[PDB]
Structure formats: C-alpha cells, structure tokens
C-alpha cells in the first residue's frame, strides 16, 4: 500500500490517538490526522483525500459502529477501509462489526507488529 495513504484516527481519548499515530509512524505511515468522535470524523472527512480509517468503538456524539455504518452507506466513501478498535473481543461486537462492513477488527492495546498484521490483511483483501 502507498506510504502516503492518508489515515484518520478516531478515538475520544487523545492519548490513544497519539499512540495509534505513533504506531503508524513506526510503520512508515506519516500522513495521519485525528478526530475525537464520529461527528468530528465526518467533518474531517469532508476535506477529502482520506484513504483509511481507524476507529474506536465507544465514543460520544457518534460511536464507532455508527460511524462505520455511515461511511459504508455514504455515496462517496462506501469502500473506505475501516479498522475497528475495541477494548474486548466479544462475539456480539465482532458480529456487529462484520454485519456493518468493518475491514478489520483489533483489540486494544496492540503492538506495532499487530497493527501491521491487520493493515496488511486489509490491503491484501482490497488489492492495495
């Protein structure tokens, strides 16, 4: 996948966003912006050019599942890769992610190696 792919990292906890941005940087992905919930995310996305979303599940105003469904049903953004992040792997939450079109699913905390594994899975499926 292109090193200059533009990521949006979405989490209501600024420290978690910083950590994810830093892991991306460690992998060579320097083109990264941040959003603090699903509403903030959609605002940022209007600027265009975004190529990959990493979103937390639990956020105020619009949560990660709500954001994912919105992106997937959007006329312009429907095929954007979205990696969902959760605090705990549960059947119900995984199946919810699957039904909504999550490109990937990862439990926090995760290492740069795990992030790379999940990104590569998504890139492979999408032919990126």
């Amino acid at each position: 996948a292109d090193k200059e792919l533009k990521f949006l990292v979405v989490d209501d906890f600024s420290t978690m966003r910083r950590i994810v941005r830093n892991l991306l940087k460690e992998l060579g992905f320097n083109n990264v912006e941040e959003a603090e919930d699903g509403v903030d995310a959609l605002n940022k996305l209007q600027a265009g050019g975004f190529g990959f979303i990493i979103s937390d599940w639990n956020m105020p105003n619009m949560d990660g599942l709500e954001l994912l469904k919105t992106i997937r049903a959007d006329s312009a953004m429907s095929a954007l890769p979205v990696l969902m992040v959760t605090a705990e792997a549960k059947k119900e939450n995984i199946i919810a992610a699957a039904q909504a079109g999550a490109s990937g699913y990862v439990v926090k905390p995760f290492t740069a190696a795990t992030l790379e594994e999940k990104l590569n899975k998504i890139f492979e499926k999408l032919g990126m």
Partner: peptide
C-alpha cells in the same frame, strides 16, 4: 467460546 471467538475472527478474515 474463546475458541469460538478465534474461529469467528478467522472466518471473517479479521
């Protein structure tokens, strides 16, 4: 059930 979670994740390509 943890095995069911791992199977589920694998089946989804997650």
């Amino acid at each position: 059930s943890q095995d069911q979670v791992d199977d589920l994740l694998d089946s989804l390509g997650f």
